Amino acid sequence: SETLNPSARIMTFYPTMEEFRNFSRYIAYIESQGAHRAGLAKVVPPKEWKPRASYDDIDDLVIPAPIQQLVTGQSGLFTQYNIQKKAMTVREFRKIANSDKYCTPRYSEFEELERKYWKNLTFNPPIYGADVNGTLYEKHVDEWNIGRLRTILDLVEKESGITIEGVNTPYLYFGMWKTSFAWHTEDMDLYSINYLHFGEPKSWYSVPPEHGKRLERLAKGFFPGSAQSCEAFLRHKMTLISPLMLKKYGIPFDKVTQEAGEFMITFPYGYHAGFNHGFNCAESTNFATRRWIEYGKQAVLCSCRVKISMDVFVRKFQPERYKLWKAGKDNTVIDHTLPTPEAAEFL
Numbered sequence: 001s002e003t004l005n006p007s008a009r010i011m012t013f014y015p016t017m018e019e020f021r022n023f024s025r026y027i028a029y030i031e032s033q034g035a036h037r038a039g040l041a042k043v044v045p046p047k048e049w050k051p052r053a054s055y056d057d058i059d060d061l062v063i064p065a066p067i068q069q070l071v072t073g074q075s076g077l078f079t080q081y082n083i084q085k086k087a088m089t090v091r092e093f094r095k096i097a098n099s100d101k102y103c104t105p106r107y108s109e110f111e112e113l114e115r116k117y118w119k120n121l122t123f124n125p126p127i128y129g130a131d132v133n134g135t136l137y138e139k140h141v142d143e144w145n146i147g148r149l150r151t152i153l154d155l156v157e158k159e160s161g162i163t164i165e166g167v168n169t170p171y172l173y174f175g176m177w178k179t180s181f182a183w184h185t186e187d188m189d190l191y192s193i194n195y196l197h198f199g200e201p202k203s204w205y206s207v208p209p210e211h212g213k214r215l216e217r218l219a220k221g222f223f224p225g226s227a228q229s230c231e232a233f234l235r236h237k238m239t240l241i242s243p244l245m246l247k248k249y250g251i252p253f254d255k256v257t258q259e260a261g262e263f264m265i266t267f268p269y270g271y272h273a274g275f276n277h278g279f280n281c282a283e284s285t286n287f288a289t290r291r292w293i294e295y296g297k298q299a300v301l302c303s304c305r306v307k308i309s310m311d312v313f314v315r316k317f318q319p320e321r322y323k324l325w326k327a328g329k330d331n332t333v334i335d336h337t338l339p340t341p342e343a344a345e346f347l
């Protein structure tokens with residue numbers, strides 16, 4: 001009923017080359033349609049548009065810190081541990097990925113492969129070429145350029161003088177079958193953008209920002225030690241929870257598969273997790289809109305080891321509230337249903 005409530009189901013958008021050219025505006029637009037309530041959206045770019053000519057010239061690209069993903073647990077609850085393996089090229093990676101030991105099993109419909117992920121994620125540890133600093137977009141590309149999105153996030157670099165790897169800059173992820181991203185929201189509960197350049201697909205789970213507290217209480221319950229140690233432990237990106245557990249404890253969630261050539265957008269306080277289907281390459285970064293600012297102020301951060309100074313945002317966009325805020329007396333309540341103020345124009 002809220003479980004099925006499609007005001008909170010993941011939407012897909014098919015913009016035109018005119019609609020597409022302006023990134024910030026199009027984000028405002030999909031929010032005017034409620035996209036943000038699912039916590040994740042898909043945007044299919046126009047058929048003409050291409051970030052690069054071909055992906056045949058990247059065999060030599062270096063993945064400095066490949067991670068091997070060791071998973072332990074049972075009954076739909078798992079903890080993922082990373083081992084940094086040594087540096088290796090895209091070609092060595094592809095070979096390992098497309099090899100007979102680590103390749104995608106046989107499947108008819110997406111749901112058979114999902115069963116095989118949840119049955120086999122603790123066996124046969126895959127290698128993810130994650131968090132590689134780089135961009136695969138050719139220099140000429142002006143539409144949806146992950147390297148330069150022109151949002152209000154740019155303030156961190158412009159005013160504050162600060163570079164934050166993978167947040168203000170783009171990252172690449174070379175996947176193989178059964179490589180995983182655990183349940184998280186973004187750093188400082190930012191938006192994210194993810195573009196699947198080539199290869200096999202990426203499946204996603206999303207929990208609506210209006211039920212994220214539910215997922216937090218659930219994780220806390222199942223990992224009481226972890227939660228005593230850090231009050232944002234999900235941010236460690238180590239915790240995997242299956243769809244069956246979510247259903248069982250009444251956490252609303254949706255799923256979607258991202259195919260090569262498609263963007264995914266995650267929204268503030270949008271919890272997501274997922275897995276790669278086989279060999280692929282995605283590019284991601286974070287970004288912001290005016291709505292983000294309050295989520296930024298309220299974001300509960302890891303208290304046991306990324307932090308963005310919000311002053312620069314409050315002074316500029318909430319000058320009237322700055323003193324009160326610095327005092328500790330601002331207590332706006334976030335309403336996760338509300339579009340960003342930039343979307344007034346779409347009525």
Ligand SMILES: O=C(O)c1ccncc1NCc1ccc(F)cc1
Nearest residue numbers: 067128130131173180181182237282
């Ligand atoms: O890998 C993805 O596709 C992904 C997607 C969305 N958010 C975070 C993501 N990855 C986070 C992550 C970072 C490093 C890892 F080793 C594993 C996962």
Ligand code: NI
Nearest residue numbers: 185186192272
């Ligand atoms: Ni993410």
Ligand SMILES: [Zn+2]
Nearest residue numbers: 230302303304
């Ligand atoms: Zn922590």
